[PDB]
mmCIF file of C-alpha atoms in Angstrom:
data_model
loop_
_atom_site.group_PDB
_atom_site.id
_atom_site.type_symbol
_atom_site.label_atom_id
_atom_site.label_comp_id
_atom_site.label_asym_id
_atom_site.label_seq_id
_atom_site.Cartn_x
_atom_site.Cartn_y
_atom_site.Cartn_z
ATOM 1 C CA UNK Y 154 103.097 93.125 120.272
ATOM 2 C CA UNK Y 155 103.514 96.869 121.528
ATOM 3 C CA UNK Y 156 102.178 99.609 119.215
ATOM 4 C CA UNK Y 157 100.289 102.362 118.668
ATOM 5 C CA UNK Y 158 96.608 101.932 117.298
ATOM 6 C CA UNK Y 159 94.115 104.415 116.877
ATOM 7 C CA UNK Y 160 90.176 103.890 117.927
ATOM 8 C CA UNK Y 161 88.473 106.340 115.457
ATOM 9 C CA UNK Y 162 84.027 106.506 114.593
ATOM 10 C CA UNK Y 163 82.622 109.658 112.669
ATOM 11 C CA UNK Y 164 79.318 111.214 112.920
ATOM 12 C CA UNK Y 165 78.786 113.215 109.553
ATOM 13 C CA UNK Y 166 82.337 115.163 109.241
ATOM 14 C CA UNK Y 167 82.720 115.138 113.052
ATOM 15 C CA UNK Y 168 85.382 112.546 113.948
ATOM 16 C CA UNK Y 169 86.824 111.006 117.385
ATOM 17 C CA UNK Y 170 90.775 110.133 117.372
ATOM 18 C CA UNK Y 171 91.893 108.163 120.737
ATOM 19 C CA UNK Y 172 94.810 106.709 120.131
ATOM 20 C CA UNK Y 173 95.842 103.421 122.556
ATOM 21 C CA UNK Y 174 99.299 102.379 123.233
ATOM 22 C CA UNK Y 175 99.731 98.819 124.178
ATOM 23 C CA UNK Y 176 103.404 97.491 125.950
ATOM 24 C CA UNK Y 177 104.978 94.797 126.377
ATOM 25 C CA UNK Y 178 107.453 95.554 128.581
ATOM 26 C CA UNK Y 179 105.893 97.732 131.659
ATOM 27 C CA UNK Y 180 107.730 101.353 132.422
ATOM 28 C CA UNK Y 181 108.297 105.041 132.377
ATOM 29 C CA UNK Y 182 107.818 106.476 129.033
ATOM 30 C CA UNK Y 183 107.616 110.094 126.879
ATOM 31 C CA UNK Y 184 104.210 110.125 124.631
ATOM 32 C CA UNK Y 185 103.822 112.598 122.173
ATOM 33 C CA UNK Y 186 101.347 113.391 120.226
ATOM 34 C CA UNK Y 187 101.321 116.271 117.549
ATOM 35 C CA UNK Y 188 98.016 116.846 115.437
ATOM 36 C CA UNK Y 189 97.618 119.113 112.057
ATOM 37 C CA UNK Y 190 94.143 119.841 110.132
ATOM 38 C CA UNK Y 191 94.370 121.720 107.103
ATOM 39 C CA UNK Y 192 91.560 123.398 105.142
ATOM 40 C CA UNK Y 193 90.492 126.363 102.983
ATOM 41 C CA UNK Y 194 89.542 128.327 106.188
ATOM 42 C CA UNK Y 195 92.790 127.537 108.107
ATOM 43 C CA UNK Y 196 95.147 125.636 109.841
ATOM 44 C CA UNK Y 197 94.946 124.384 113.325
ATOM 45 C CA UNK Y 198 98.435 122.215 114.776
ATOM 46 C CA UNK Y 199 98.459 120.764 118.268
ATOM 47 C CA UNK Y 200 101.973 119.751 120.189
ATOM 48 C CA UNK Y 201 101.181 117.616 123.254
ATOM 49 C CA UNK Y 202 104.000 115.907 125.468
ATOM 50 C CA UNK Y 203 103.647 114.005 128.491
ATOM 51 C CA UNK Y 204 105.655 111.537 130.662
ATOM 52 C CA UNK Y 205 103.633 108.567 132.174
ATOM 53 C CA UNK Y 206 104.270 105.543 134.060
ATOM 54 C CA UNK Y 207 102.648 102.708 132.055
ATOM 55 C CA UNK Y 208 101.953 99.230 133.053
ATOM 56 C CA UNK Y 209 101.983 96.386 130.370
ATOM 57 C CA UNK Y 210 99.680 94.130 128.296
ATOM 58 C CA UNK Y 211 96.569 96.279 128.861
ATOM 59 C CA UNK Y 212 95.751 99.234 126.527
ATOM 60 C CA UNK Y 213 95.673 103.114 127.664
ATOM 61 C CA UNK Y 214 93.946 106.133 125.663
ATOM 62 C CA UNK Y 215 96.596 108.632 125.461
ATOM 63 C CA UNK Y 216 94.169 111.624 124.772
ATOM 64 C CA UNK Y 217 91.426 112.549 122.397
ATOM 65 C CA UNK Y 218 90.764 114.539 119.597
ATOM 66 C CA UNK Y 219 87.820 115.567 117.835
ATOM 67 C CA UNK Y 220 88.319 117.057 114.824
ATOM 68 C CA UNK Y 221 86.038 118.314 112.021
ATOM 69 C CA UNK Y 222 87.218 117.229 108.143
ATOM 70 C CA UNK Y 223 85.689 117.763 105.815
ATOM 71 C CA UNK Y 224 86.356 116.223 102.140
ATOM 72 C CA UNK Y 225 88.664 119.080 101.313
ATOM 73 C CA UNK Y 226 90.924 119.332 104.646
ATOM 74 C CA UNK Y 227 93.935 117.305 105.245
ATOM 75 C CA UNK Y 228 94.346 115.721 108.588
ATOM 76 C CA UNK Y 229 97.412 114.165 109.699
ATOM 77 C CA UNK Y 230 98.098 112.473 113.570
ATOM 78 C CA UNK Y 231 101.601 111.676 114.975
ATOM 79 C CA UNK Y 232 101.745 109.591 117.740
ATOM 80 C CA UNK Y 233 105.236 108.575 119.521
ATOM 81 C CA UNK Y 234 105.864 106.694 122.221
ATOM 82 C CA UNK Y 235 109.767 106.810 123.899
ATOM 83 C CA UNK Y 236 112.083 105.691 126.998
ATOM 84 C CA UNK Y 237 115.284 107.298 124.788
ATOM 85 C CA UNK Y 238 116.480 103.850 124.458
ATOM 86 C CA UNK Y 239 115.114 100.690 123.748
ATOM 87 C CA UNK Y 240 111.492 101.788 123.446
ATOM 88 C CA UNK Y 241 110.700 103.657 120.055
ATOM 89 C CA UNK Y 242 107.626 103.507 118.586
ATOM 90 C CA UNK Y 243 105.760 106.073 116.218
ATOM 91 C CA UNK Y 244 102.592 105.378 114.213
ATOM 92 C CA UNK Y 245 100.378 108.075 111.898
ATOM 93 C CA UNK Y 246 96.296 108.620 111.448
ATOM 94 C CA UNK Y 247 95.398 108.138 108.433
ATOM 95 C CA UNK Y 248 96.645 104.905 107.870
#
């Protein structure tokens, strides 16, 4: 299988997002990764694009974010993964 997964822990409200892409098929690919938290304080989105040569069958940790949520905030975690052709894949945090 190639996909996206996400290793996540929490300490309290303080919680670690690395997301991992595994391939199948080795190559050059566009990741992206866009993050939004949402609370009664504010609002903080991250946009994050880079192009990396990726070898197969071995996992990589495509960045990682530590965000603070608390039981009112929304978080949501967009992860894509893209050659423009062939490759496609997209997964979101929270399951």
């Amino acid at each position: 299988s190639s996909q996206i997964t996400f290793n996540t822990t929490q300490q309290g409200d303080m919680y670690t997002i690395i997301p991992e892409v595994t391939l199948t098929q080795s190559c050059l690919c566009r990741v992206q990764i866009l993050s939004l938290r949402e609370g009664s304080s504010g609002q903080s989105q991250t946009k994050q694009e880079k192009t990396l040569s990726l070898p197969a069958n071995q996992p990589i940790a495509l960045t990682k974010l530590s965000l603070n949520i608390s039981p009112d905030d929304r978080v949501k975690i967009v992860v894509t993964v893209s050659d423009g052709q062939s490759l496609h894949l997209s997964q979101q945090w929270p399951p």
